[PDB]
Amino acid sequence: GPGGTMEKLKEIVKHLEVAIKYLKEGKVDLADLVVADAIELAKEAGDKASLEILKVAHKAIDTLGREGKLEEAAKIVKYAKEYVEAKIKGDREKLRELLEKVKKDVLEAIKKGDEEFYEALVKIARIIAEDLGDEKSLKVLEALEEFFKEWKRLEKEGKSLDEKLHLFLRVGERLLEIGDKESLEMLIELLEELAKEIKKAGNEELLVRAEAAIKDIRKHIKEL
Amino acid sequence: GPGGTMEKLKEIVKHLEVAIKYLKEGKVDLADLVVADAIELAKEAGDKASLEILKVAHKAIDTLGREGKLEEAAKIVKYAKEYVEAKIKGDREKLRELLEKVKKDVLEAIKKGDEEFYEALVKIARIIAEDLGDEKSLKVLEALEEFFKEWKRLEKEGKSLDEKLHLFLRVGERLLEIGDKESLEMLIELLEELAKEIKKAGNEELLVRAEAAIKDIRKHIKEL
Amino acid sequence: GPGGTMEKLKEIVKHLEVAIKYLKEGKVDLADLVVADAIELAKEAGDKASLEILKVAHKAIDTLGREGKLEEAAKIVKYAKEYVEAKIKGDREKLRELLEKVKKDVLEAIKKGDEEFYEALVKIARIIAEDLGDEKSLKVLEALEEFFKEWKRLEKEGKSLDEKLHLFLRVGERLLEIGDKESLEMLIELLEELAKEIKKAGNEELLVRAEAAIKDIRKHIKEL
Ligand SMILES: [Zn+2]
Ligand SMILES: [Zn+2]
Ligand SMILES: [Zn+2]
Ligand SMILES: [Zn+2]
Ligand SMILES: [Zn+2]
Ligand SMILES: [Zn+2]
């Protein structure tokens, strides 16, 4: 009770609900103020775990909510509310499901190309994973971070396709060593896209390697 | 970065822009809440320099914004936003221009007679001048403070006009000693106003002194 | 002087020459005693850098010298003596050459398959590189450590050669990312050995991937 199972945390959940309600109709400044009030309440509970995710939600409001992407900040606020409400009940089996959903959206964001959504998503994933004693969901996070940053670096400049292919091989081997499977179909799709791009060009002796890589990771996914 | 060049300070700037937008359409309580949120953000950056000016902006909202003077609190919030944004870039040549504009506004307010605007402008000017290592723009601030307070004291009561004249000579000599120029033509205008008041009355042997004072100070400014 | 440029350090060097002389004629216990005396002397110099490498030399005597490998512990003690004598002269351009020789010996040991020599060599390399401010010579050391441990784990058990190929690709991508080229021809030779082993077997659809790997890595080595 008294800020350990209910009361203050229930107030935070109610405020987050009002924030989502405001977001779903368009008022972004009011939702930002409500999230600031929720952060002020959380600073008086001595949790050190909900304060960070509420700050992440506030920053998500700032970035995504102000611009045209209004449905990507409501998702962050919903994840914050669900993380808090899975802590007001002392439930650990729900944090794993929340982390699974968060990781699926990080994969979706990487596949799409959203930048502002991705940072808040990985921040939430790290916060959940550091409070769950999970290390198989954090090294995948680091590998995806490196992959995304290096992909952006190569796409901004005009580097050749060989370095991008090397990126794909490196991240595929890293995830294969990890053993994660849900992060591998996205990489398979991206490798197929790169193979289609290469097939447009006349350069050879790199397409056979790419096709062999796709077949190998697909076979391992079937095994996994 | 991380609250030293951007991030938190950029959030403060964005909230200040939202507050000004709210002010230019009339919602004062929402702007007050936004400024309170900005103050809460600034309290988490450890600056000791933007927090005070944001508090001054909050008080300016309280005083001017709640009353009919909606264009004089938007000015304070704009000055706060510009001071913060001239600090997120590490620019010192812009703080001098901001101080010049603030001092011009102080002189305009003293010429008009605004009381709530005057205190906020003086607080902003002192905050800027205590961070720029300037002592020429502070002694003139003290002289104008004393001049305004004594003017209000004489005008509230029924003191004789000779005391007002002595006040005028005293402040004119003080500003001549400090060497400031932009603060002295306002004194000339006030001296002409008092001379016009004197010429209305039949009392003599004090008006020629007033004319000589105006001519001498005008000649000194021409030299200045 | 007095244990900072000469005296005690020259005593240690002379004892190291005596240790080499004993090792080259066969007396291993006497060389071990001499190295222990040198360690005792170094403990009275407060270097914190020569003591560790002398301990490494002592352990190398213990392991390699006791068995028939008498030419592999003399090399370790020689490297220790050269490291000390390159510190009695205040020379930094010689530590780089010593690190080059040590890394070349690490590569030769990995290619040959020696285990006791390898650990002493990487210990010496780590001690030298932690006193030279080099980070391009440490990540390659970590990659080679992981490669050797995983290679031994695969060779001891009855794992399939597909995981061996995955190991090869992984370490090749890591070495390409760091950019080291002198550690890559040993990997080239091991990859050709694995390709010859695969050609013995009738299994296909993995030989083409391997061959493309050698071609690509050799092309990159030419570029490097
Ligand atoms: Zn806010
Ligand atoms: Zn495979
Ligand atoms: Zn307020
Ligand atoms: Zn004069
Ligand atoms: Zn011994
Ligand atoms: Zn390549």
What is the compact description of this entry?
With 224 residues, chain A is mostly helical. Chain A contains ten helices and no strands.
Key words describing this protein structure:
part of a larger assembly; 10 helices; mainly alpha; 224 residues; 3 chains
Describe the structure.
The structure is cut from a larger assembly and holds 3 copies of chain A (224 residues). The first copy, chain A, has 224 residues and is mainly alpha-helical. Chain A is built from 10 helices and no strands. In chain A, helix 7 packs antiparallel against helix 8. Chains A and B meet through helix 2 and helix 3 of A and helix 1 and helix 2 of B. Bound molecules: zinc ion (6 copies). One zinc ion binds next to helix 2 of chain A.
How would you classify the quaternary structure? Answer: part of a larger assembly
The profile of the biggest β sheet of chain A is: none
In percent terms, what proportion of residues of chain A is strand?
Answer: under 5%
Ligand inventory: zinc ion
The most extensive interface, with participating residues per chain, is: A-C, 15 and 14 residues
Using only C-alpha atoms, the radius of gyration of chain A works out to 20 Å
| Count of distinct strands of chain A | 0
Which structural class matches the secondary elements of chain A? mainly alpha
